[PDB]
mmCIF file of all heavy atoms in Angstrom:
data_model
loop_
_atom_site.group_PDB
_atom_site.id
_atom_site.type_symbol
_atom_site.label_atom_id
_atom_site.label_comp_id
_atom_site.label_asym_id
_atom_site.label_seq_id
_atom_site.Cartn_x
_atom_site.Cartn_y
_atom_site.Cartn_z
ATOM 1 N N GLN C 172 10.678 6.338 -30.484
ATOM 2 C CA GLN C 172 10.578 5.698 -29.175
ATOM 3 C C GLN C 172 10.911 6.687 -28.064
ATOM 4 O O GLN C 172 10.218 6.826 -27.096
ATOM 5 C CB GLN C 172 11.446 4.490 -29.086
ATOM 6 C CG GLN C 172 11.087 3.356 -29.995
ATOM 7 C CD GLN C 172 12.196 2.392 -30.367
ATOM 8 O OE1 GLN C 172 13.384 2.700 -30.048
ATOM 9 N NE2 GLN C 172 11.850 1.314 -30.863
ATOM 10 N N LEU C 173 12.043 7.458 -28.291
ATOM 11 C CA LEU C 173 12.474 8.350 -27.284
ATOM 12 C C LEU C 173 11.503 9.498 -27.111
ATOM 13 O O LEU C 173 11.214 9.899 -26.012
ATOM 14 C CB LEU C 173 13.878 8.900 -27.641
ATOM 15 C CG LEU C 173 14.984 7.892 -27.517
ATOM 16 C CD1 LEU C 173 16.327 8.476 -27.971
ATOM 17 C CD2 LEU C 173 15.122 7.255 -26.166
ATOM 18 N N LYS C 174 10.972 9.960 -28.248
ATOM 19 C CA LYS C 174 10.007 11.150 -28.281
ATOM 20 C C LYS C 174 8.800 10.692 -27.423
ATOM 21 O O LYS C 174 8.349 11.430 -26.596
ATOM 22 C CB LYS C 174 9.620 11.451 -29.639
ATOM 23 N N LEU C 175 8.351 9.488 -27.631
ATOM 24 C CA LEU C 175 7.198 8.886 -26.901
ATOM 25 C C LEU C 175 7.598 8.792 -25.397
ATOM 26 O O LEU C 175 6.823 9.065 -24.537
ATOM 27 C CB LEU C 175 6.726 7.627 -27.511
ATOM 28 C CG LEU C 175 5.265 7.222 -27.250
ATOM 29 C CD1 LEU C 175 4.459 8.388 -27.019
ATOM 30 C CD2 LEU C 175 4.731 6.365 -28.406
ATOM 31 N N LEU C 176 8.816 8.261 -25.204
ATOM 32 C CA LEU C 176 9.177 8.003 -23.792
ATOM 33 C C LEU C 176 8.953 9.292 -23.024
ATOM 34 O O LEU C 176 8.380 9.245 -21.914
ATOM 35 C CB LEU C 176 10.655 7.560 -23.737
ATOM 36 C CG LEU C 176 11.182 7.315 -22.289
ATOM 37 C CD1 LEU C 176 10.733 6.068 -21.694
ATOM 38 C CD2 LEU C 176 12.728 7.364 -22.327
ATOM 39 N N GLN C 177 9.465 10.441 -23.530
ATOM 40 C CA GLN C 177 9.392 11.712 -22.761
ATOM 41 C C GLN C 177 7.938 12.034 -22.556
ATOM 42 O O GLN C 177 7.582 12.405 -21.502
ATOM 43 C CB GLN C 177 10.206 12.739 -23.406
ATOM 44 C CG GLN C 177 11.674 12.835 -22.958
ATOM 45 C CD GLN C 177 11.695 13.155 -21.462
ATOM 46 O OE1 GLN C 177 11.512 14.300 -21.053
ATOM 47 N NE2 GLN C 177 12.013 12.163 -20.572
ATOM 48 N N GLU C 178 7.032 11.816 -23.566
ATOM 49 C CA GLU C 178 5.604 11.987 -23.446
ATOM 50 C C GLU C 178 5.125 11.123 -22.303
ATOM 51 O O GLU C 178 4.365 11.565 -21.523
ATOM 52 C CB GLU C 178 4.968 11.685 -24.782
ATOM 53 C CG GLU C 178 5.262 12.602 -25.895
ATOM 54 C CD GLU C 178 4.651 12.205 -27.206
ATOM 55 O OE1 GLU C 178 3.410 12.031 -27.235
ATOM 56 O OE2 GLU C 178 5.304 12.148 -28.243
ATOM 57 N N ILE C 179 5.468 9.794 -22.374
ATOM 58 C CA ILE C 179 4.818 8.823 -21.361
ATOM 59 C C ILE C 179 5.134 9.362 -19.997
ATOM 60 O O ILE C 179 4.203 9.406 -19.203
ATOM 61 C CB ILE C 179 5.397 7.415 -21.596
ATOM 62 C CG1 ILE C 179 5.097 6.879 -22.944
ATOM 63 C CG2 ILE C 179 4.981 6.565 -20.466
ATOM 64 C CD1 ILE C 179 5.959 5.722 -23.415
ATOM 65 N N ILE C 180 6.366 9.692 -19.743
ATOM 66 C CA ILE C 180 6.744 10.030 -18.316
ATOM 67 C C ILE C 180 6.189 11.381 -17.938
ATOM 68 O O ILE C 180 5.639 11.520 -16.817
ATOM 69 C CB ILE C 180 8.311 9.997 -18.131
ATOM 70 C CG1 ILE C 180 8.879 8.795 -18.845
ATOM 71 C CG2 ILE C 180 8.697 10.019 -16.626
ATOM 72 C CD1 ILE C 180 10.373 8.732 -18.852
ATOM 73 N N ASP C 181 6.202 12.346 -18.857
ATOM 74 C CA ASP C 181 5.788 13.759 -18.564
ATOM 75 C C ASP C 181 4.271 13.878 -18.555
ATOM 76 O O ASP C 181 3.666 14.357 -17.595
ATOM 77 C CB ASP C 181 6.462 14.733 -19.454
ATOM 78 C CG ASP C 181 7.937 14.768 -19.357
ATOM 79 O OD1 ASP C 181 8.507 13.841 -18.748
ATOM 80 O OD2 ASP C 181 8.562 15.702 -19.938
ATOM 81 N N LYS C 182 3.653 13.421 -19.690
ATOM 82 C CA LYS C 182 2.174 13.420 -19.851
ATOM 83 C C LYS C 182 1.569 12.438 -18.802
ATOM 84 O O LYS C 182 0.341 12.492 -18.580
ATOM 85 C CB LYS C 182 1.782 13.031 -21.263
ATOM 86 C CG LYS C 182 2.213 13.981 -22.400
ATOM 87 C CD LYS C 182 1.619 13.688 -23.684
ATOM 88 N N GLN C 183 2.400 11.466 -18.381
ATOM 89 C CA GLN C 183 1.990 10.345 -17.475
ATOM 90 C C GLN C 183 0.981 9.439 -18.130
ATOM 91 O O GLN C 183 -0.047 9.163 -17.456
ATOM 92 C CB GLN C 183 1.421 10.877 -16.106
ATOM 93 C CG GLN C 183 2.382 11.730 -15.293
ATOM 94 C CD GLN C 183 1.622 12.369 -14.118
ATOM 95 O OE1 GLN C 183 0.625 13.097 -14.304
ATOM 96 N NE2 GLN C 183 2.142 12.160 -12.901
ATOM 97 N N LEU C 184 1.224 8.981 -19.281
ATOM 98 C CA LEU C 184 0.387 8.020 -20.088
ATOM 99 C C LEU C 184 0.421 6.649 -19.451
ATOM 100 O O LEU C 184 1.459 6.317 -18.750
ATOM 101 C CB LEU C 184 0.898 7.995 -21.570
ATOM 102 C CG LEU C 184 0.900 9.256 -22.337
ATOM 103 C CD1 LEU C 184 1.395 9.112 -23.772
ATOM 104 C CD2 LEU C 184 -0.537 9.848 -22.411
ATOM 105 N N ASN C 185 -0.649 5.913 -19.623
ATOM 106 C CA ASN C 185 -0.820 4.480 -19.173
ATOM 107 C C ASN C 185 -0.217 3.581 -20.258
ATOM 108 O O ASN C 185 0.460 4.077 -21.172
ATOM 109 C CB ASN C 185 -2.222 4.183 -18.812
ATOM 110 C CG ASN C 185 -3.152 4.304 -19.988
ATOM 111 O OD1 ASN C 185 -2.962 5.082 -20.915
ATOM 112 N ND2 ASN C 185 -4.278 3.587 -19.945
ATOM 113 N N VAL C 186 -0.479 2.290 -20.130
ATOM 114 C CA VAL C 186 -0.092 1.282 -21.184
ATOM 115 C C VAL C 186 -1.090 1.367 -22.414
ATOM 116 O O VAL C 186 -0.564 1.342 -23.523
ATOM 117 C CB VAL C 186 -0.098 -0.167 -20.563
ATOM 118 C CG1 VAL C 186 0.211 -1.227 -21.607
ATOM 119 C CG2 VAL C 186 0.893 -0.307 -19.449
ATOM 120 N N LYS C 187 -2.354 1.578 -22.145
ATOM 121 C CA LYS C 187 -3.390 1.648 -23.177
ATOM 122 C C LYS C 187 -3.018 2.729 -24.209
ATOM 123 O O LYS C 187 -2.879 2.419 -25.368
ATOM 124 C CB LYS C 187 -4.726 1.839 -22.537
ATOM 125 N N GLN C 188 -2.850 4.037 -23.731
ATOM 126 C CA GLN C 188 -2.758 5.225 -24.565
ATOM 127 C C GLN C 188 -1.366 5.265 -25.201
ATOM 128 O O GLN C 188 -1.207 5.942 -26.218
ATOM 129 C CB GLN C 188 -3.011 6.458 -23.671
ATOM 130 C CG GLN C 188 -4.511 6.629 -23.389
ATOM 131 C CD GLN C 188 -4.868 8.019 -22.874
ATOM 132 O OE1 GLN C 188 -4.262 8.572 -21.934
ATOM 133 N NE2 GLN C 188 -5.792 8.663 -23.514
#
Side-chain angles (χ1 to χ4, degrees), chain C residues 172-173 175-181 183-186 188:
Chain C
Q172 291 157 348
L173 289 181
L175 203 26
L176 175 75
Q177 267 298 285
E178 293 177 52
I179 296 159
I180 318 174
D181 298 12
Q183 297 173 306
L184 298 178
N185 61 333
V186 174
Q188 287 194 307

